[PDB]
């Protein structure tokens, strides 16, 4: 009906879906953290 309320916060789902470990397990995730430190972003993970 009414949108915008998509993000229902859950910390466990958050860190499992976008955690350091998942990004290090997936080979492409290593490239994610590499591009991110390359650009110089402060938080490499969530």
């Amino acid at each position: 009906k009414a949108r915008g309320n998509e993000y229902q916060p859950s910390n466990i789902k958050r860190k499992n879906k976008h955690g350091w470990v998942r990004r290090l397990s997936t080979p492409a995730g290593v490239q994610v953290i590499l591009r991110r430190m390359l650009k110089g972003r402060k938080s490499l993970s969530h």
Binding site: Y7, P9, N11, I12, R14, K42, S43, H46
Partner: protein, 124 residues
């Protein structure tokens, strides 16, 4: 949405993370048999406190004392000032060899000694 810059802490997660995270406190024992915790006097540290009776040293130094140049200690200095007397006197009086070096003071292998040095078990 969620904040990234704030450092992760036990406060942020659900009950499970709040329990499992830990805030830097180091271990004291273990936990078994229905969340029954048990500490051990062994793992419990023991502060070593001497007596202060007949102790004249004071935390502050008087300005009357003169300046003394730096003397960063080093292995060669310590050996030449401490052990060299014994070595030279035993040389020029009796006889010795690379053996019996534990007499002069030397740990050929660190195991079997309480205070290991590399890796060191003790702290500070």
């Amino acid at each position: 949405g969620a904040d990234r810059m704030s450092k992760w802490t036990s406060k942020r997660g659900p009950r499970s993370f709040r329990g499992r995270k830990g805030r830097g406190a180091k271990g004291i024992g273990f936990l078994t048999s229905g969340w029954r915790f048990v500490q051990i006097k062994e793992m419990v540290p023991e502060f070593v406190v001497p007596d202060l009776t007949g102790f004249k040293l004071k935390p502050y130094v008087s300005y009357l004392a003169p300046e003394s140049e730096e003397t960063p200690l080093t292995a060669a200095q310590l050996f030449s000032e401490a052990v060299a007397p014994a070595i030279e006197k035993d040389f020029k009086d009796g006889t010795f060899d690379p053996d019996n070096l534990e007499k002069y003071g030397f740990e050929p292998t660190q195991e079997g000694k309480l205070f290991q040095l590399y890796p060191r078990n003790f702290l500070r």
